[PDB]
């Protein structure tokens, strides 16, 4: 009876389950993608999806791109800096959502360089036609095995440009989601702070 009530009322119970870190088999990247595309469709109202790319119907740019899975993309013992998981284009802004890895020696490879960010912004200008004068790009590092309330709030504020009040109006379970970062992993916390406290890279 309780499981039936849960599945009947909480439509995103699996997403909450994966975000809290209970899913040990396939992580939480699929649930993150479902959450992001849900927010994108609720915002655009004319969202069209085709495989791993979700695009709005022109107007304001609303693009979500599932590049690859960084866990399998990253190969130990090799030299290749910059592997993003999700790419979100909202308006003239580009955000590179990257899920951290459990290996502290791979995060530095995972985070793309300033030159890489500039090149990606230039490619966005080339393809979408967004003028180079107003183009911003930035990174977003997410915890490896879960997704805490602070990270979710920052994701909503930066990527989808949603304030806390309207985010809670859209999502009922968000205000009761009270997961915090693991106190043990200080390397990731410092990296996330120094990555999320930087300004947008222009042009």
């Amino acid at each position: 009876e309780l499981v039936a009530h849960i599945v009947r009322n909480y439509s995103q119970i699996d997403i909450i389950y994966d975000f809290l870190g209970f899913n040990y088999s396939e992580g939480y990247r699929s649930s993150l993608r479902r959450y992001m595309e849900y927010l994108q469709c609720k915002t655009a109202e004319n969202v069209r999806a085709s495989g791993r790319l979700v695009t709005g119907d022109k107007g304001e740019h609303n693009i979500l791109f599932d590049y690859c899975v960084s866990r399998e993309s990253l190969v130990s013992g090799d030299s290749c800096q910059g592997i993003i998981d999700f790419l979100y284009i909202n308006g003239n802004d580009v955000t590179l959502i990257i899920i951290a890895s459990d290996n502290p020696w791979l995060r530095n490879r995972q985070l793309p360089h300033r030159r890489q960010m500039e090149g990606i912004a230039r490619r966005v200008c080339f393809v979408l036609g967004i003028p180079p004068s107003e183009v911003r790009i930035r990174n977003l590092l997410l915890p490896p095995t879960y997704l805490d309330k602070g990270s979710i709030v920052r994701l909503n504020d930066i990527v989808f440009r949603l304030s806390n009040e309207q985010s809670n109006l859209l999502i009922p379970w968000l205000t009761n989601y009270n997961k915090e970062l693991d106190p043990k992993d200080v390397d990731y916390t410092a990296l996330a702070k120094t990555t999320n406290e930087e300004e947008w890279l222009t042009l």
């Binding site: 009947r8 009322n9 909480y10 009922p172 379970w173 205000t175 009761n176």
Partner: protein, 98 residues
């Protein structure tokens, strides 16, 4: 250094001699000590003193989800569609000519 040897305080490093719970013997922590430290528990704002903090904190979310579930969905699965071979060809960008 003693600041490094002893555990830190609230705003950073603190000398162990600056804590009353450290420099005051336990046998003398009754009476005047309680009078001094009563305000640390029983003094503050009216909301801080009267608001019950042991109540339900998810009732709003639960009622929102209940009313959302009771509310129906106007759009359902496209069971009324023809689902024909021509429809499949149009889905694949094909037709009879192709």
């Amino acid at each position: 250094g003693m600041m490094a040897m002893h555990p830190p305080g609230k705003d950073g490093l603190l000398m162990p001699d600056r804590v009353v719970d450290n420099r005051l013997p336990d046998h003398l922590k009754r009476g005047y000590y309680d009078d001094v430290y009563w305000k640390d528990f029983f003094a503050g704002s009216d909301e801080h003193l009267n608001e019950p903090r042991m109540g339900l904190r998810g009732d709003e979310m639960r009622r929102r989800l209940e009313e959302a579930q009771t509310s129906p969905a106007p759009t359902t699965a496209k069971d009324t569609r023809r689902r024909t071979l021509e429809d499949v060809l149009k889905r694949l960008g094909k037709t009879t000519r192709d």
